[PDB]
Amino acid sequence: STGSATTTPIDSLDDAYITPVQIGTPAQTLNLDFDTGSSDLWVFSSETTASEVDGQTIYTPSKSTTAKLLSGATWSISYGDGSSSSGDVYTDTVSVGGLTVTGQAVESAKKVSSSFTEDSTIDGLLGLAFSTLNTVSPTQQKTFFDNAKASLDSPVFTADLGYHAPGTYNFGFIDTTAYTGSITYTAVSTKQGFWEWTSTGYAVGSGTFKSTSIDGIADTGTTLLYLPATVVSAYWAQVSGAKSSSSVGGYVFPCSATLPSFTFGVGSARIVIPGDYIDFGPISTGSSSCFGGIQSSAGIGINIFGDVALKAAFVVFNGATTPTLGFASK
Numbered sequence: 001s002t003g004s005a006t007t008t009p010i011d012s013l014d015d016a017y018i019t020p021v022q023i024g025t026p027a028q029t030l031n032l033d034f035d036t037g038s039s040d041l042w043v044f045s046s047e048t049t050a051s052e053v054d055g056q057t058i059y060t061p062s063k064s065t066t067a068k069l070l071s072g073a074t075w076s077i078s079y080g081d082g083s084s085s086s087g088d089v090y091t092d093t094v095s096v097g098g099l100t101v102t103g104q105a106v107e108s109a110k111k112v113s114s115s116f117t118e119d120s121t122i123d124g125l126l127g128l129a130f131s132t133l134n135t136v137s138p139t140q141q142k143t144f145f146d147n148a149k150a151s152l153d154s155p156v157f158t159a160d161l162g163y164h165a166p167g168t169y170n171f172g173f174i175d176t177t178a179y180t181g182s183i184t185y186t187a188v189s190t191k192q193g194f195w196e197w198t199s200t201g202y203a204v205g206s207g208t209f210k211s212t213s214i215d216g217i218a219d220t221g222t223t224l225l226y227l228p229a230t231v232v233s234a235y236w237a238q239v240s241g242a243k244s245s246s247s248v249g250g251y252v253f254p255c256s257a258t259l260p261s262f263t264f265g266v267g268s269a270r271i272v273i274p275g276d277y278i279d280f281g282p283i284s285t286g287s288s289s290c291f292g293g294i295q296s297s298a299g300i301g302i303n304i305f306g307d308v309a310l311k312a313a314f315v316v317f318n319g320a321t322t323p324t325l326g327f328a329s330k
């Protein structure tokens with residue numbers, strides 16, 4: 001079997017991407033944030049504290065003939081940005097773009113942090129990291145991908161995120177019409193539960209490529225590109241007037257500047273991020289200082305190839321018994 005679904009940016013800055021997902025019988029369609037950096041499928045629901053819901057579409061298990069409460073199971077998650085949510089667990093039928101999984105753990109939010117309440121466009125998250133990170137207790141649950149793996153034609157999914165435009169998540173097949181050239185595959189470590197890999201170096205604009213190993217995770221659920229302080233300083237040094245701002249919390253630059261591209265290495269291949277992808281606009285309405293899409297990972301503890309980097313490529317998440325990541329230009 002295969003599945004294919006369109007994913008759409010939630011705003012004009014590509015801060016996140018939502019993908020419609022059918023849950024329950026009859027279908028309740030929710031727009032979820034597909035997150036390869038986490039492993040919980042959780043939704044706003046009829047159980048969510050009413051004051052904490054502001055425009056989101058909610059899942060109502062009581063209206064689904066296939067929903068079953070998972071007795072005694074709870075979940076609680078904290079994300080690297082300080083957001084958090086928690087609740088109880090149902091099993092139900094979940095379909096993504098024609099691909100159906102029965103008995104998927106659907107985690108019903110009873111409490112969500114303020115950042116989720118304020119994001120009216122995101123109805124929940126669909127985790128696509130490895131199932132060892134799932135937070136359901138006392139019985140850990142599998143991700144949608146892990147549950148679908150056996151019935152997929154190929155145990156893969158692909159992310160084709162658009163720049164200010166819709167894109168595609170495919171499950172079970174690789175669309176050879178969606179990229180140019182060849183796909184370069186690189187080894188993945190699952191030891192931390194992430195799609196963790198090693199980039200072979202970088203270049204700024206038309207500069208010399210610096211060969212150097214950068215270990216990081218491929219994370220569709222993170223907006224920006226977080227890299228070591230040395231790399232990030234080398235990039236922003238090429239932008240006139242750019243500086244790291246403690247009050248703002250990262251590098252900013254004059255909105256009138258033109259940004260250089262950023263290249264990162266995948267084995268012997270190169271993925272080029274156009275400079276326009278790194279512009280995240282004014283720090284406040286009307287400001288002439290703009291926020292940069294490449295920031296330091298120093299305070300985070302791990303390097304993160306977020307949407308800024310991934311949307312410049314066609315990305316294969318190969319969930320074979322030895323997992324790999326594939327990158328191609330597009």
Ligand SMILES: NCc1ccc(C(F)(F)F)cc1
Pocket residue numbers: 035036037038079080081219220221222300302304
């Ligand atoms: N997108 C999920 C996510 C968020 C944060 C992190 C961090 F901060 F731990 F790296 C990993 C994964």
Ligand SMILES: NCc1ccc(C(F)(F)F)cc1
Pocket residue numbers: 016033035037038079080081083115116119122221222
């Ligand atoms: N990295 C996971 C994640 C994804 C989205 C959000 C947001 F945008 F809803 F705040 C927070 C955390």
